[PDB]
Structure 1
């Protein structure tokens, strides 16, 4: 009754639905806590990440850096494969993928540069060939430059700069953090206070309005205690903006319009600690002495409830939900609550290979100085136990185990982890994604299915900027691990393969293993 190709198409349709039923983040990070890790040696074929190459800082940048009179700073434009260095009032960009790069110098600025960022342009403003806007903040003003990052035959963007006549006086508030939205909105913050500013700009000059303006969205007044920002974070999928303060206060702002920004949540460390105390498992790794060192937004495509990850200096990952009071009038949330905690692993890095309760006391990630999360959960933590050498903890969801876990009530935040050692003197500065953002589906269910996209998009790669160079870290897929493991079985017995294969079956299941 039903011919071959139609029968096989039925199998495809049911297989597509099976891959798109991969558990969403909310489902395996339910209220509670977890310490589930399988640690892998960095030199193992089972390593979830590994360093593929490194790019030294050009010698000319070292000449300028050591010629610094007062202030210097480094940063990453990982989206286009560029890095930058500021020396006092001078800025230098370069393509770090190029073996002998030329330095793009920009020295028009009159005062010390305090922040630099590469953001999308405002639509309908610039010629289509302008791909980005370069924001340069000094102690006196903020400067906008047009950017065209067109790809070259070699695979590294060609960068040319355009003047704009767009600039505004800074004012009294320091600018150390610049972030941009998908639509080209530019937000500013710094180390003077917790105020958030926005830069507006338009093509036409008017007699009653300049081409470029600046406004303070915080509208402060009266008595104000000392407090400033540690970072700004954007989530376009929810039209939200987050700030982290030096007191570990998390503020949430909603973009109710193309020119509006409204503060809708303010959650201090005490509130986080109160939520934590109401959880079943309390821990000495999170107290009133603990600092939150970084935030990472979680987009709505990845999870409905969990909006935000917060990293403590003890290495705890705090996952916070946010909820609106109502269901209709984007809808702004009005509450934020600490729901789930991923506690640190226990295994420390070792030169020699060393040999079920919730582990809520590990110090392996203490102190955590910098932290980053990328969908579907790739986690980088800069652990600074010693003041000269950084250790990099890198982990990923155990996609294979999460996909096979049954029933749904048994789902936990299983992870594969590893330690990547940086040489003595390497101080990590920034980590950015070099490939396209990960997404296996368009909604939380199916979103995190790494297995499904092994052959549709290249493995994620991450540029780790240090004070000596840029290191490229690459995510390894099942097929990469399987191929590497088999490569070690080439010189062994019939039973040597069967043993290695059984490791894969016990983690990924038989079908996924045979498919690899």
Structure 2
């Protein structure tokens, strides 16, 4: 009867309804055929278009310039948490601010070609558990682990070597991934699987 209690009840009921909403995927939904609202044309779905392209940012020429000479190998990617993009040409690696572009960081640490890079979470309990993210970089010879963080003063990017080197000469580490246990699994061009533990040692999961 009281309006206040009444209103609360209405919202709660509605909230419950919102939560109950059907599961996204069900086989029954498109068992016969998929309903599709599919236009080949951009903005063909006028009102409905799910996505729009807000902006395009070119790679800064300053960044590109230090990518000009690359005999052996190129690769690039985006780090999702960082909101930064990375470029690898041979031995060197660049990280550049998505929002800025002027702001770029460069790794001079690596001596050799960089096979792969990856962003991973730190382990539950190591000396660097605190850091938000870790940057794993694998070259032919070694795997290096560094820490990424944001300066609170400048708001710049801080990279510190967490001197941890893992010899992985034979591996030719193709891929790296992690479980948010903090465990890192990587594969070389040596079959299916291997796992690294920082606490350097490599241990093959799939048995040697």
* TM tier, smaller: 0.7 to 0.9
Q: What is the correspondence of 1:109-508 to structure 2 with a 5 Å cutoff?
A: 109-127=110-128, 130-150=131-151, 158-190=156-188, 192-202=189-199, 212-220=200-208
State the alpha-carbon separation in 1 of the partners of residues 6 and 134 from structure 2: 52
- Does the residue aligned with 1:20 lie in a helix, a strand or coil? helix
Runs of 4+ in 1 over 4 A off after TM superposition: 28-31, 150-153
Compared with structure 1, are the counterparts of its residues 150 and 51 closer, same or farther at alpha carbon in structure 2 (3 Å cutoff)?
farther
CA drift of 1:30 comes to 6.0
- Does the residue aligned with 1:113 lie in a helix, a strand or coil? coil
State the alpha-carbon separation in 1 of the partners of residues 5 and 128 from structure 2: 49
Are 2:6 and 1:7 equivalent residues in the alignment? yes
- Does the residue aligned with 2:35 lie in a helix, a strand or coil? coil
1:23 aligned residue = 22
Instruction: Give CA-to-partner distance per residue, 1:283-319, whole Å, 9 cap, x none.
Output: xxxxxxxxxxxxxxxxxxxxxxxxxxxxxxxxxxxxx
Compared with structure 1, are the counterparts of its residues 178 and 128 closer, same or farther at alpha carbon in structure 2 (3 Å cutoff)?
closer
Compared with structure 1, are the counterparts of its residues 179 and 151 closer, same or farther at alpha carbon in structure 2 (3 Å cutoff)?
farther
Q: How many pairs were matched up?
A: 205
1:282 aligned residue = none
State the alpha-carbon separation in 2 of the partners of residues 145 and 45 from structure 1: 46
CA drift of 1:97 comes to 1.0
Instruction: Give CA-to-partner distance per residue, 1:345-401, whole Å, 9 cap, x none.
Output: xxxxxxxxxxxxxxxxxxxxxxxxxxxxxxxxxxxxxxxxxxxxxxxxxxxxxxxxx
State the alpha-carbon separation in 2 of the partners of residues 29 and 143 from structure 1: 48
Asked if 1 retains the 8 angstrom alpha-carbon contact of 2:135 and 2:145, the reply is yes
| Higher percent of residues as helix | 1
2:91 aligned residue = 89
Instruction: Give CA-to-partner distance per residue, 1:317-351, whole Å, 9 cap, x none.
Output: xxxxxxxxxxxxxxxxxxxxxxxxxxxxxxxxxxx
Asked if 2 retains the 8 angstrom alpha-carbon contact of 1:147 and 1:159, the reply is yes
Instruction: Give unmatched runs, 5+ long, in structure 2.
Output: none
State the alpha-carbon separation in 1 of the partners of residues 8 and 42 from structure 2: 41
Comparing 36-45 and 136-145, the one that deviates more: 36-45
State the alpha-carbon separation in 1 of the partners of residues 11 and 153 from structure 2: 38
State the alpha-carbon separation in 1 of the partners of residues 161 and 64 from structure 2: 27
Compared with structure 1, are the counterparts of its residues 51 and 31 closer, same or farther at alpha carbon in structure 2 (3 Å cutoff)?
closer
CA drift of 1:183 comes to 2.4
State the alpha-carbon separation in 2 of the partners of residues 128 and 101 from structure 1: 30
CA drift of 1:25 comes to 3.1
1:32 aligned residue = 31
How big is the alpha-carbon RMSD for the aligned residues of Structure 1 and Structure 2?
2.3
Compared with structure 1, are the counterparts of its residues 173 and 34 closer, same or farther at alpha carbon in structure 2 (3 Å cutoff)?
farther
Compared with structure 1, are the counterparts of its residues 150 and 49 closer, same or farther at alpha carbon in structure 2 (3 Å cutoff)?
farther
State the alpha-carbon separation in 2 of the partners of residues 46 and 25 from structure 1: 19
